[PDB]
Curated annotation (Swiss-Prot):
GO molecular function, a single term: serine-type endopeptidase activity
GO cellular component, as recorded: extracellular region
UniProt name for this protein: Proteinase K
Shown segment, full-protein numbering: 106 to 384 of 384
GO BP annotations, alphabetical order: proteolysis
Residues reported to bind Ca(2+) 1: P175, V177, D200
Keyword Protease recorded: yes
Domain of life: Eukaryota
Organism, scientific name: Parengyodontium album
Taxonomic lineage of the native organism: Eukaryota, Fungi, Dikarya, Ascomycota, Pezizomycotina
Length: 279
């Protein structure tokens, strides 16, 4: 399938070259997979989600996304226009308040929630969790991410936006999950992207158009935007049967575009997420 005039990041993930604008992908489109977006919530009523999004958990007075961040990330995972995996089921877990903040104890509870809650959902092609969040190093936060991954969920986490080594941030620094840095439309490391040996992969993160609250759209930047590209890609590849939740990060690295990014510090992988779809 071909989506013309797609957001640059979608075109990038199906291309051997920057500078194109059509996204190519197998029509299975993540059908039968599920992606949890652990964030500020999801505006599930947005027409772009087509009834495939729902809130399943909140730790606050509402499950609504009063911020926009979680809706934007969910749109990159799975919205009809802005999403990688256009037929996945999206489940929102609101661990962040409407200011975008959240206590680590709530974030940990949300991760353990997903590990159990997947057993209450129909996801025959597999389960992914997208975590566009983080703070300073915490062994407990890393352990929660490790448990979620161990339970059979492909965990993708943001590297962070400090232009620093991600070893000092969580859950970015957890080795067993998929830690995602950000790139721009010219294949440069995004100016804010964290780096370091703990990164597994880069995805599009600068000037990413997606859904926003109030039934709207906007373009924003961050490793928060790169992470859902990778989460959606994992769901898509799992639906195709090419990989599993336990092996998808490694498979994405195996099949990535290699050596094409600029300003990658020595010792950080130079790998850009790529669906290897042949139309």
């Amino acid at each position: 399938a071909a989506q013309t005039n797609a957001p640059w990041g979608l075109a990038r993930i199906s291309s051997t070259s920057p500078g194109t604008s059509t996204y190519y992908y197998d029509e299975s489109a993540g059908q039968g997979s599920c992606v949890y977006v652990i964030d500020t919530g999801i505006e599930a009523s947005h027409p772009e989600f087509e009834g495939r999004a729902q809130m399943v958990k909140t730790y606050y007075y509402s499950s609504r996304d009063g911020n926009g961040h979680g809706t934007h990330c969910a749109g990159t995972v799975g919205s009809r226009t802005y999403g990688v995996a256009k037929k996945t089921q999206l489940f929102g877990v609101k661990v962040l308040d409407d200011n975008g903040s959240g206590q680590y104890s709530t974030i940990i509870a949300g991760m353990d929630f997903v590990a159990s809650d997947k057993n209450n959902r129909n996801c025959p092609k597999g389960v992914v969790a997208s975590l566009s969040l983080g703070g300073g190093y915490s062994s407990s936060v890393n352990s929660a991410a490790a448990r979620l991954q161990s339970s059979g969920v492909m965990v993708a986490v943001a590297a962070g936006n400090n232009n620093a080594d991600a070893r000092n941030y969580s859950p970015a620094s957890e080795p067993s999950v998929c830690t995602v840095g950000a790139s721009d439309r010219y294949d440069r490391r995004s100016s804010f992207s964290n780096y370091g040996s703990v990164l597994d992969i880069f995805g599009p993160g600068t000037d990413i158009l997606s859904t926003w609250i109030g039934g709207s759209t906007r373009s924003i930047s961050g490793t928060s935007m790169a992470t859902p590209h990778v989460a959606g890609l994992a769901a898509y590849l799992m639906t195709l049967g090419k990989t599993t939740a336990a092996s998808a990060c490694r498979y994405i690295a195996d099949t990535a575009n290699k050596g094409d990014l600029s300003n990658i510090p020595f010792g950080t992988v130079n790998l850009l997420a790529y669906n290897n779809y042949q139309a």
